[PDB]
Every structure is written in structure tokens, then in C-alpha cells.
């Protein structure tokens, strides 16, 4: 159990959105509501998914069939969350494929300002200092000149760029052949694929912190002092990065839940799984931030402005601290190998968990076998076909909707508090607890008891009107703001998830006889 | 102060009906899992029956899975046993165990009620 | 059911001497989930020893436990005159709870 998901959540929402997340964020702040998100609500609400998946003999969708039938469509906003999740996944895994295969090469293409696309605004990051800033580096400008060739507005797509379409189709590949149509990390968990990326991490780490100057990026990301949080984009950007990198309001670990014993301890072992995700997500910032304070000390540049405040942080920062790190070209081939490694195990949860949901929802209505094998391929074109549309010019703009409006925003904090809700409000939170003495063999405590009733649904609420009441747009990289059709494209992918609930519950109402109060009363009773 | 105290203890003819009632203080009875516990007159003792917090999971010893009944009274703290076809092998010193958090068993037991079968 | 088979039940321990009994699972107990009970001459038993290695409140030092899986033991350093009781160990895994036998600890 355990070998399959700790690389199902330790993938590139630890080594690559909170890093951004931080950043954009103001770094010292967004651990704050990190923090109180994490054991508030992540790892109550990562017990609980675990737990729903554990009781019920099945997962995803019919698993609010034991649980309050009448809010089944958690497992419906669990699949468009899970689906939008998926495409602009993979999409980070094509990026980070185009940096691997531009890497085998002996000069890294981020190394140096001689090159094809770089502006005549391009100095190396050791003349910075020197020339006296309206001035790019080549990590950012690489980047978002050869790997983005990004545009000027989500409004100008260009043209859909050559060779990114070409590793998001060998990024679908590898995930349509090694999902149903062969096998996924069976004996290559032990002694890699699990402890080389910790390795890794920890030679990116030890690479961070010794770097000069990384001493004031240690202090941008661990002091409060800017960015205050009296603004929420601090609070539901750190709850959905909690929601994010747990994958819990997903419909994955309730997928991962079914496959386990009913009578199975899965507490101490949910607890240490959280524990080393945030840990990993904690380790990789301090990585990353210690980069970012060289890189501002070497540019002479603020570290809130020395690279990309949005999802290229990752890929600017870790590629930074590759150049400056002995035989460059190496060590970028083994870390966008490791990115391949985190994304492809989280992918291939992702879409197996999305897979079995699907399967639990339609059993022979799709044939197993025939068509069983014909539905991967099927949605693998379709995720990849609106994957496409984050692989043009206009590509991060698209992508930076999805990342925080798509699988990551006002949905993850419904389901969650819907989650939370369910359970305390209905089911109740003694009768689940009963269920879980029957399973693990203890009640959980006040902890788990008054966060679930409680604490969870306070604030995923609060961080809800808080995001409303003093609303704030969505703006790429602090100085691009969003259209008004991008805003509504936006809250229509957000809305796609967070209106699979009322629209399961007018149907349920609509679709059983009787007075309103006995239907509700017959659609809540678990069966 | 937690104490668990039983009632209902007589002799019955084999095959007979006797109901006890494990009366019980001093804890939120209704966030619990009882249990009760019998001691053969040979002391050698022998888990009957369990019942979960909410009453809703109850489990048998293989030997009275089939004419055991154990049932709570939450409103009131009461823990009650029916028995009936009750046969010559039955009797022994009933117990009362307060078993919730199975990593820590049976952490409060009550008195005996003997049990006997003539 | 689990059958529980233990130590033989009656032995004779001087004070101040360190004596130990087993306890034999004949399937796989998960050594979070066994437990160690001691009955009193004539009273009602009480929880000794939780999950094979902790003690209840009232236990004294004492006592300790060691083992998993299948064999499992209780461990005495040194036996006082409030040791004359009778000792059942007990699995709390499978859900035919079973309690072993006798270990009726006695004096000379």
C-alpha cells in the first residue's frame, strides 16, 4: 500500500507548486495558513478520504453509496477535479521532458546569453552586478522565450509550438503504455524510483544552502514579515496546496482506500505518509528559496523579482542551481529525470485512481478486456487534445488557469468542507468513529473528531468568503492580469467541479417519490 | 470513577432464558465498546460477546453465535446479555469488559455474576 | 478461533526472584493488538499489560513484556508477595476474541 503512495502524493506539487506557491505568496506568510491547513485540515481530511475508501468495498463515486447517498456527487466533483487535474499534469511533465532533451547536450541552453532566442535585454547572471532592472536572465528568458515562447496574453495563442506537442505525446505515451497496457513500478520501487528522487532533493538542497547569499532566501521563506495576511489569496493558495499535494479532494486515495484491508492500522500510517510529504515539500523550499536568495544576490535584484512568481519557478530556480553546480549537463538530466519519476508515479495514481472510479461508476457497461483497453486510449487522446491548448504560445496563461482555478482553488475547498460536512453533519462523526474502532481498532481523537466537525469545515468557509468578500483577480507573474472571458473560463472549470454536488442532489430529489422531507431523510440513510 | 457493575446472576435450567445488566458510571458510556467476558468455574476465561460504541457492529464468540444476544442502553448506561437455549456448558462468572481502543483491551472490568446451569 | 496456548499454569515463584511465563498464538497476532491480564485470587482480572511491551495504570515496573507475531511473553524482574494471581495473556486482533489459559503464579 504504502510503496504505491508515497510516490502517489510526493510528486511535483512538493518539488514544484509550493515552491511557486510560496514565492508568489511572499514566502515567510504562505506557511502560516500552510501550516494551519495542514493539521487543521490536510491530514483530517487525508484520514478521512483514506478511511471513506477503506469502509466502503468500493471507491470513488459509489463509495457515497455507504456514506450519505444523497451527496454522491463528491465522487463526481472528485472525477472533473481529477480529470482537469490530469491535463495540466501531464502538461508540467512535457515541460519538464523539453528541458531533459534539451540537457544532452555539453552547453546547457540556460547557461548562457548567446543563444537564438535570447533579446539584446540579456546580460549572464555574473555581469549583473557589474553593468550598475529592465534586464532578464537567461534562466527566465530561456524559458520563457524557447521552452513557453511565451505570448503576449492568453488572448494570442500564436500558434501551437512544435516539439512541446511532441513531448506531451511522449509524456501520454508513457502514460497509455504503462497504466492498463503494462505494468507500473513493481520491482523498481526498491533502491530507485523512491529514494533517488529523496537523493536528489537532498543534492539540490545541499547545493541551495551553500550557494552565496541563500541565507537572505532562507529568510524571505521563513519570515512573515511581507505579504500580510489580511489579503486571502495566502490562505486558499496554502489550503490548496494542502488539498493539492495530499490529492484529497480527488477521488484518488478513496480509489487507493477499497484496495486495502478492512481491519488495516491506516492512521499511524497516514499520519507518516503527511509528515513526509510536507516534510518534502518543507526540505524542497528550503532548496528552492535558498537558490532564489543566489539568484538575487548575484542579479542585485529583490528576491520577490528575480524569477517568475507563477509555474516556472520550478523550472527557472532548479535549472539555475543545475548550472551552477559541477558537470551541469548530468545533474539536469538526472533532475527532470527525477521530475519525470514524481509526475509519471503521481500521473500514473492519478488516472489509475480516475480509471477505477470510472469503472466502479459504469461495471460492464464498458466491457473489460475489449473495451476496457479502448477507454485508456480514449482518455488519453481526450486529456491530451486539452492538453494541447497549454502547449501553445499562449500556454502558461491557459495553464496558470487551470493551476488555480481548474483542481486547485474555490473546488478543492468545497469538496473538502462537503467531505467534512457529510461525515460530522449527517453520518456523524460518533458513528464514524465507530467505523473506524471497528477498522483500525481506536476512535480517533479530538483531533480528527472536532476537525472534521468543526475546525475543516471553519475554514475552508472562511478562506472561502474570505476569497469573496475582498476578492482579488488572478493575475500571471504579478504584472498580467486576466481577461474578463479568462476569469469566467476560469470560474466555469471551478464551477464544473463544485456543481457536481447541488446538481446530484436536484437529481436525486427529482428522480425519488415522495415529500421532500422523506426523500431527504430516505437519500441520507447509508445503504 | 469508573466501575461497571453487573446484576441478573441465579441458576437456570439448561436450555433456559436469564438476561444480565452490566449497569454502568463514571464514562460516556455511548463513546465505549463493551464486551463481556466469562470465567469458567474451572477459571479458565473466555470472551462471549462484544458491541461497538454505537451498537451498530456486534460480534460472538464462535461457541454463542448462534442464541447470544448483547445489547446497550445508551440513555441510561446499561450493558445487557440475553441468553437463551442456554445449555449445561454455559455456565461460569460473567464479566463485563470495557473494550474500545484495541491496542489497549478490556481496561476496565466489572463484577462476577455467577452463572450457574443445573 | 485463535487458540492461545500458554505457559503451564501452576508454578511455584520465590520472592525476589525473576520468573517469566509465554504465551504461544497459533496464528499471527499483530503485537499492537495482544494483551496481558492478571486475576487476583478470587476477584475479577484486570488489564496488566497492553499491546505486549506497555503497562496499565497501577502496573508496577516490574512487569514487561517482549516478543511478537507468535510467541509472546511476560517478563518479572523480581516477584513481591502481591504477586500470587493468576496471569491470562489475550489477542485483540481476530474477532473471536480468545484469552489463553491459566498461569496461576503461586508461592512456596
Known amino acids: 500500500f504504502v510503496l504505491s503512495v508515497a510516490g502517489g502524493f510526493v510528486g511535483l506539487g512538493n518539488v514544484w507548486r509550493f515552491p511557486y506557491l510560496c514565492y508568489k505568496n511572499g514566502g515567510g506568510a504562505f506557511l502560516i495558513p500552510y501550516f494551519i491547513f495542514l493539521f487543521g485540515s490536510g491530514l483530517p481530511v487525508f484520514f478521512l478520504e483514506v478511511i471513506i475508501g477503506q469502509y466502503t468495498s468500493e471507491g470513488g463515486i459509489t463509495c457515497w453509496e455507504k456514506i450519505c447517498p444523497l451527496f454522491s456527487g463528491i465522487g463526481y466533483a472528485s472525477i472533473v477535479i481529477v480529470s482537469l487535474l490530469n491535463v495540466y499534469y501531464i502538461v508540467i511533465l512535457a515541460w519538464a521532458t523539453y528541458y531533459l532533451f534539451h540537457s544532452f547536450q555539453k552547453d546547457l541552453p540556460w547557461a548562457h546569453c548567446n543563444h537564438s532566442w535570447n533579446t539584446p535585454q540579456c546580460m549572464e547572471d555574473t555581469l549583473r552586478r557589474n553593468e550598475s532592472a529592465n534586464f532578464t536572465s537567461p534562466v527566465i528568458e530561456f524559458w520563457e522565450r524557447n521552452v513557453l515562447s511565451l505570448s503576449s496574453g492568453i488572448d494570442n495563442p500564436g500558434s501551437l509550438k512544435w516539439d512541446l506537442a511532441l513531448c506531451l505525446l511522449l509524456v501520454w505515451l508513457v502514460c497509455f503504455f504503462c497504466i492498463w497496457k503494462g505494468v507500473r513500478s513493481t520491482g523498481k520501487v526498491v533502491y530507485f524510483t523512491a529514494t533517488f528522487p529523496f537523493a536528489m532533493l537532498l543534492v539540490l538542497l545541499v547545493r541551495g544552502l551553500t550557494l552565496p547569499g541563500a541565507g537572505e532566501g532562507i529568510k524571505f521563506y521563513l519570515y512573515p514579515d511581507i505579504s500580510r495576511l489580511g489579503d486571502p489569496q495566502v490562505w486558499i493558495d496554502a489550503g490548496t496546496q494542502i488539498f493539492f499535494s495530499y490529492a484529497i479532494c480527488l477521488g484518488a486515495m478513496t480509489s487507493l482506500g477499497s484496495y486495502n484491508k478492512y481491519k488495516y492500522n491506516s492512521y499511524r500510517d497516514c499520519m507518516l505518509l503527511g509528515c513526509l510529504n510536507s516534510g518534502t515539500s518543507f526540505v524542497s523550499g528550503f532548496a528552492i528559496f535558498s537558490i532564489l536568495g543566489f539568484m538575487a544576490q548575484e542579479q542585485g535584484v529583490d528576491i520577490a523579482d528575480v524569477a517568475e512568481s507563477g509555474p516556472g519557478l520550478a523550472f527557472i530556480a532548479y535549472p539555475k542551481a543545475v548550472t551552477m553546480m559541477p558537470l551541469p549537463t548530468f545533474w539536469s538530466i538526472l533532475f527532470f529525470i527525477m521530475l519525470l519519476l514524481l509526475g509519471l508515479d503521481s500521473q500514473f495514481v492519478e488516472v489509475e485512481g480516475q480509471i477505477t472510479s470510472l469503472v466502479d461508476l459504469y461495471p460492464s457497461f464498458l466491457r473489460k478486456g475489449y473495451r476496457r483497453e479502448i477507454f485508456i486510449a480514449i482518455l488519453c487522446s481526450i486529456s491530451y487534445l486539452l492538453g494541447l491548448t497549454m502547449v501553445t504560445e499562449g500556454g502558461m496563461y491557459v495553464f496558470q488557469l487551470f493551476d488555480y482555478y481548474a483542481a486547485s482553488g474555490v473546488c478543492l475547498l468545497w469538496v473538502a468542507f462537503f467531505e467534512c460536512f457529510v461525515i460530522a453533519w449527517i453520518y456523524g462523526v460518533n458513528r464514524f468513529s465507530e467505523d473506524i474502532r471497528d477498522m483500525i481498532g481506536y476512535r480517533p481523537g479530538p483531533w480528527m473528531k472536532y476537525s472534521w466537525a468543526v475546525i475543516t469545515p471553519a475554514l475552508c468557509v472562511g478562506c472561502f468568503v474570505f476569497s469573496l468578500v475582498k476578492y482579488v483577480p488572478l493575475t500571471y507573474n504579478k504584472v498580467y492580469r486576466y481577461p474578463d472571458w479568462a476569469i469566467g473560463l476560469g470560474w466555469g472549470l471551478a464551477l464544473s467541479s463544485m456543481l457536481c454536488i447541488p446538481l446530484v442532489i436536484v437529481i436525486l430529489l427529482c428522480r425519488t417519490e415522495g415529500p421532500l422531507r422523506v426523500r431527504i431523510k430516505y437519500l441520507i440513510t447509508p445503504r | 470513577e469508573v466501575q461497571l457493575v453487573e446484576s441478573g446472576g441465579g441458576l437456570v435450567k439448561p436450555g433456559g432464558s436469564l438476561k444480565l445488566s452490566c449497569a454502568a458510571s463514571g464514562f460516556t458510556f455511548s463513546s465505549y465498546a463493551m464486551s463481556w467476558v466469562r470465567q469458567s468455574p474451572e477459571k479458565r476465561l473466555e470472551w462471549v460477546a462484544e458491541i461497538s460504541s454505537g451498537g451498530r457492529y456486534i460480534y460472538y464468540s464462535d461457541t454463542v453465535t448462534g442464541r447470544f444476544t448483547i445489547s446497550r442502553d445508551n440513555a441510561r448506561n446499561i450493558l445487557h446479555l440475553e441468553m437463551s437455549s442456554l445449555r449445561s456448558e454455559d455456565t461460569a462468572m460473567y464479566y463485563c469488559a470495557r473494550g474500545e481502543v484495541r491496542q489497549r483491551g478490556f481496561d476496565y472490568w466489572g463484577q462476577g455474576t455467577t452463572l450457574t446451569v443445573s | 478461533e485463535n487458540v492461545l496456548t500458554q505457559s503451564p499454569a501452576i508454578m511455584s515463584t520465590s520472592p525476589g526472584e525473576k520468573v517469566t511465563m509465554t504465551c504461544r498464538a497459533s496464528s499471527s497476532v499483530g503485537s499492537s493488538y495482544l494483551h496481558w491480564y492478571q486475576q487476583k485470587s478470587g476477584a475479577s482480572p484486570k488489564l496488566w499489560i497492553y499491546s505486549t511491551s506497555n503497562l496499565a495504570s497501577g502496573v508496577p515496573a516490574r512487569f514487561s513484556g517482549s516478543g511478537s507475531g507468535t510467541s509472546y511473553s511476560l517478563t518479572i524482574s523480581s516477584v513481591e508477595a502481591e504477586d500470587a494471581a493468576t496471569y491470562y495473556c489475550?489477542?485483540?486482533?481476530?474477532?473471536?476474541?480468545?484469552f489463553g489459559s491459566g498461569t496461576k503464579l503461586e508461592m512456596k
Open positions: 489475550q489477542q485483540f486482533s481476530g474477532y473471536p476474541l480468545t
